[PDB]
Amino acid sequence: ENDLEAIELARFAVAEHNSKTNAMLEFERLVKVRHQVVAGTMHHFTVQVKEAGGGKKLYEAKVWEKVWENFKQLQSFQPV
Amino acid sequence: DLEAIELARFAVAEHNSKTNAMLEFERLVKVRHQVVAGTMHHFTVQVKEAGGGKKLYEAKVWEKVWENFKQLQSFQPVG
Numbered sequence: 001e002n003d004l005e006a007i008e009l010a011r012f013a014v015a016e017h018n019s020k021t022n023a024m025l026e027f028e029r030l031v032k033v034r035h036q037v038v039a040g041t042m043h044h045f046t047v048q049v050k051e052a053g054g055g056k057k058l059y060e061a062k063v064w065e066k067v068w069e070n071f072k073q074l075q076s077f078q079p080v
Numbered sequence: 081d082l083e084a085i086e087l088a089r090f091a092v093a094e095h096n097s098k099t100n101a102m103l104e105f106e107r108l109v110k111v112r113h114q115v116v117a118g119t120m121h122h123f124t125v126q127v128k129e130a131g132g133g134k135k136l137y138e139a140k141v142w143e144k145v146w147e148n149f150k151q152l153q154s155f156q157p158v159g
Contacts, residue, residue, distance in 0.1 A: 009150065010123045013139040016152035025127040028134055032124035039117045045088045046110035049103040056106065061091040072087070074094040 001033040040066045046080065084111045118144040124158065 001007075010030040017023055043063040051057050058080035065072045085108050092105045123139045140153035 006121070006123075009121055009141050009143065010125050010139070012150060013123060013141050013152055013155060014125065014127055014137075017137075017139075017155040020152070020155075024130050025135075025137075026129075028126040028128050030123055031126050031136070032122075034122040036120040036122065038120055042114040042116055043084070043087050044110070044112040044114065045084075045091060045108060047088050047092065047108055048106040049092060050106050051103060052101075057103075058109075059092075059095075059103075061088065061095075063087050063091050065087070072090060074091050074098075077091065077095045 001030065003033075006030060006033050039068055040064055040071075042075075081111065084108065084113075117146055118142060118149075120153070 007030050010033075011027045014025055014027045018025060041064075043061075043065065045059075045061040045063070047059045047061055049057050049059055060076070060078045060080055061074065062076040063072060064075050088108045088111075089105050092103060096102055119142075121141045121143065123141070125137050125139055126134055127137060128134055136158045137155060138158055139155045141150055142153050143150040
């Protein structure tokens with residue numbers, strides 16, 4: 001892309017690599033761009049369950065939901 | 081929220097589907113809803129080095145759309 005904004009982010013990328021690593025690379029050109037729109041909610045649940053033998057345990061769940069799509073997915077399920 | 085209680089029921093139901101643990105939802109005790117909204121940009125970039133010589137790198141920049149925020153996620157040579 002020759003979109004001026006994409007070039008500006010690419011420069012930002014190089015400049016950030018330079019300040020993170022002290023690399024002194026110079027931006028020459030942007031030879032490829034792919035944009036990935038992300039729009040969702042990450043839900044964080046602490047939840048009480050009834051285990052196999054009747055035991056009451058605590059779990060932390062992470063659900064990722066896309067808001068302009070029909071997509072929910074459990075990311076993580078973890079004891080507390 | 082009662083839809084938060086609904087996502088949780090799914091979360092437990094999903095775990096059981098995927099592990100077969102047959103845990104049963106009792107009660108929802110904490111909730112937090114984190115809105116994520118932005119663009120992940122993937123760039124192949126040509127740079128000049130010290131000194132000199134040109135070279136390709138692949139970069140990833142996360143950018144928030146409703147906030148003034150951009151961040152370098154990744155910066156790596158192509159092989």
